A paper describes a structure:
The CA portion of all retroviral Gag proteins folds into two separate domains, the N-terminal domain (CANTD) and C-terminal domain (CACTD). Our results show that, like lentiviruses, RSV is sensitive to IP6 in vitro and in cells, where in the mature CA lattice IP6 binds in a pore formed in the center of the CANTD hexamer.
In order to classify hexamer and/or pentamer (unit) pairs according to their geometrical context, we grouped them using two criteria that we found to influence the geometry of the mature CA lattice: (1) the presence and location of one or more pentamers in the vicinity of a hexamer, and (2) the orientation of a pair of hexamers with respect to the local curvature. For further analysis, we rigid-body fitted individual CA domains into the EM density maps of hexamer/pentamer unit pairs. Pentamers, on the other hand, organize rigid vertices, where the lattice is curved in different directions. Specifically, the two CA monomers facing a pentamer adopt an arrangement similar to those two CA monomers in the pentamer, causing an increased spatial separation between the CANTD’s of the hexamer. State A was found in all dimer interfaces involving pentamers (with higher curvature) and low curvature hexamer–hexamer interfaces, whereas state B was found only in hexamer–hexamer interfaces with high curvature.
Author numbering:
A (entry chain H), D (entry chain C), I (entry chain J), J (entry chain F): 10 to 148
B (entry chain G), E (entry chain A), F (entry chain D), H (entry chain I): 152 to 229
C (entry chain B), G (entry chain E): 10 to 148, 152 to 229
């Protein structure tokens, strides 16, 4: 069952990003805090939509896609990925990682249903690395 | 008005990009026409130093995020 | 039977030579067009009398004579010329080529009667080469600068024209055009070419790059 | 048997390009008109030599070469090209497309002899696309 | 009138030759007297730079076309 | 002092590079810290024309010699 | 046995490079002189460390590495390199060329022991070519005009210098020098060259003609 | 004295040649040294207009008579 | 037997050439008068030495040689020259025309002995034409 | 075996030419000194490249070529040239004199191998005469 993040925590994090900036160690610590439980693509996408401005959000979408593509290359380079399965029918496509696959587009409940925990942690680590890249790039 | 937005002589590029994306997304354009307009406004606004920086891009930039990343990488630190 | 060329085509060709000049590729194409069927000496002579001015016509008469003399030297160097015959009685004299022989002076009908098709095609090729020589002679790359108000495509057109229509070898035109793009073409475009992250090794590539990144104004 | 294009039509087209420019819809319509019958490499080459200036002609040679190379890549990607044949002995090299092959250099009659109709239409479409590219690039 | 034709201080040589040949051939002279007159008018008209250029001709020029070719070759580019 | 070296408005780039490399190598830095410092001083000193010239480098320059070669190639002749 | 180069010769060469520069023909001749016997990587490295400044030395290290890499590519493209051997165990790695291999780092005696004469001559030629590249890089013909008061031999010297010390191919220098003599070289000499009864087809012939018939003033 | 003979600014060339040949043949030179001396005096005397006229001779003149004929042909009528 | 021309007539002709010039019709008439009887090479040579200055004399020697060479070409082109004979042993060399042959150098008596009347008239006409050329050239 | 000239002597000679000029008797004496041993085309070419400026060097190349051509004309006029041999296979071409022949272009060692001593002394005398001509011409 999907539970959304508190809008109070999200508002506090957005104001933190607004006053301290993207690169302060306190901001990265707060992001790591709100990045503790494995989030669904819907959660991370809406979170970055709210806390980041338009241009940093575009940059972050780009960087997240690139990092997810590196993850999928490593996944096709190793059939023992915690997102993959043993047979070929469990291979994870980027539509399933970005939340674009069938039964997931716009629906967080179905998303949480079909996604694997390894998928969730890989998406989360990818999003964190992308946030770091964009923060280092913006300023 | 989005079509009247220029990057000031002293303004940074992230502020200009924020202002432009805000004015373009909060306007009367269809949703499928915002990205091309944002790109073509990055190319024609954004005073001629960044204009030439985007023009001489060995890669083809097909997204506002990619253009922003490229410009932030290769911008003239000043 | 001799049929004259249309005065309408001749008038259009004369106006083409008058506006475009003698050396433009469109003018040479038009001349090649009106030089399609083998012409009698009368036809080519009157054609050059009409389309060319007096001084270019004198130059062209000279050049045509020289080229016909080279042809007659090659003809006496080979008895199998399409203008010649097998016996010595068919050897072709310059009076027969220039239309000065007996039964031909001023009469195009008799001309067409006695002349050979090989004679006609040799005369025609000679006249074409003479026209090319005179055109190259009648009308400096290192003095070409891009004006303060001139666009870049006009400057490139002028420079490539003057470099290709000059005395340089064919293998020295591209490097000269490149190095003239780099040193002429006023300092804004000079710096635009200098700061090229890629290496431009062809005039076309330089033109494309400059047209992409030029300062719209 | 090869028949040349009328120098009257070519002169009119050259003056059209001179007054209206390269990109006007009337100019493109006129080019499409003079691009109706499949032309031999000699014809298109001389046509572009006459109607285009020196620098646009260089650009057009470049673009025509690139488009012909794309065509030859598609041809080696499909043995059923109307320019190709069934056996390997009919594979079409760029020397045959640009008119540089043996028995074709400078001779339009031999050109028309050895060339295929599929070869002619491919060359013609390539030249038209190259003209469009150069026209979009010049202004 | 052919005998009144001079090469102007700023006029090129091909224009002067065209004008002179026109006026000489469209005149009352016999046909066998046009070439010598054209030559001797090239030599005495055609302001003293070209006069000296024709005078110091190592070869003997015996035709208006040859004189025109020689002068066009060795003329002072300006 | 290496951290006080600036490229003068009229100074050429090879003189500035000579002075900077001299002051950096004849200082108290460890040997393994001279190249990164020389690079980052080329990037932040070396007045904004050369700063932007180094910034917009399509290739990544990872050595003082490579930076010097690139700048000498693409420098504004004046 | 390794013998070092004289510090007196090295000091004289360093002062030559300091006063004349890197590109003067006397400097290149002196470098060729001190590049006569095949040098060990230690010798050439210390020589360039002493005679070149810091930034030219960095550039020279880069260029030397690139040229040595081209040499090693040619060596793997031909097993008959005078640095290589017949078997695969004599293949020469860049650590052995740059003096970085085992038993060579910092020791010139061991260097001279293990190195081949072909290795030495290849290293030496590579270093010479790298020096030439850096000299051409460390320090415009189409902008050269003959000043109103300048003599013609000075203008010819300046023009030939700038044309031969440029990026043109070797087969394009003479035509460019001629056509620059004709279009530059203020209109008195322009007309003097134009009205040449003979055809001048060489810069030396043009210079001789102009020096003969020039207006003494 | 032959070595002091110059062509005056207003003197014609045949008078100068007469005077020079007279003074050279009526002097103390050997008979086999008169022609080369007369030629080399035509070339170095005979004020610079005729000097340049003789210098730019497409043919090689190897006799005083040939030089005189050439100069009389191509001289500047004045 | 050789008889020299009167030095009185030669002095009068020299003064005529001195006052009237080389090209006046009276001077040419006087030269034609003193060119009435066929002269030996010695006579014409001394006459031109006396009446002409040094430079016109050099020019006249050149022109006389050229005209005599044309005469000898016409003579080898026709064996019926009044200077020639029927057999090959009477062919006239330029040494015999210019007075340089054996038995003639410096001796006018021997000259008059060996020379033919056709030789004399040819030499005389050649000298007259050469005088005309030099007179037209000098002024 | 080829030995190069000392760059010290060449530097001193270059400075002599720079201060005294090309025509001073001391400069010609110094050139005669450095022209004592028979030099290979490489040596003389590099020497004139170093001591002479660009325009005098062009003039000197011209004059050297002309003098070498006169030498080769005299050589074809006499089969007993110290550069020639007795048979026709030893005839010396200008490519061998200017150092342009096969096995000589750019290589002084091979040059010294194939060249004759008569060839060397002829090249040297030709270069000296050319230097004299250019020195008399420059000033």
């Amino acid at each position: 069952a999907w539970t959304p993040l508190e809008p109070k925590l999200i508002t506090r994090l957005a104001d933190t990003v607004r006053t301290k900036g993207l690169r302060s160690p306190i901001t990265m610590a707060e992001v790591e805090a709100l990045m503790s439980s494995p989030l669904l693509p819907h959660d991370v996408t809406n979170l970055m939509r709210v806390i980041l401005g338009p241009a940093p959000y575009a940059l972050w979408m780009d960087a997240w896609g690139v990092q997810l593509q590196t993850v999928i290359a490593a996944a096709t380079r190793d059939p023992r990925h915690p997102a993959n399965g043993q047979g070929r029918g469990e291979r994870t496509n980027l539509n399933r990682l970005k939340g674009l696959a069938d039964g997931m587009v716009g629906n967080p409940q179905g998303q949480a249903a079909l996604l694997r925990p390894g998928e969730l942690v890989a998406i989360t680590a990818s999003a964190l690395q992308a946030f770091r890249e964009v923060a280092r790039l913006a300023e």
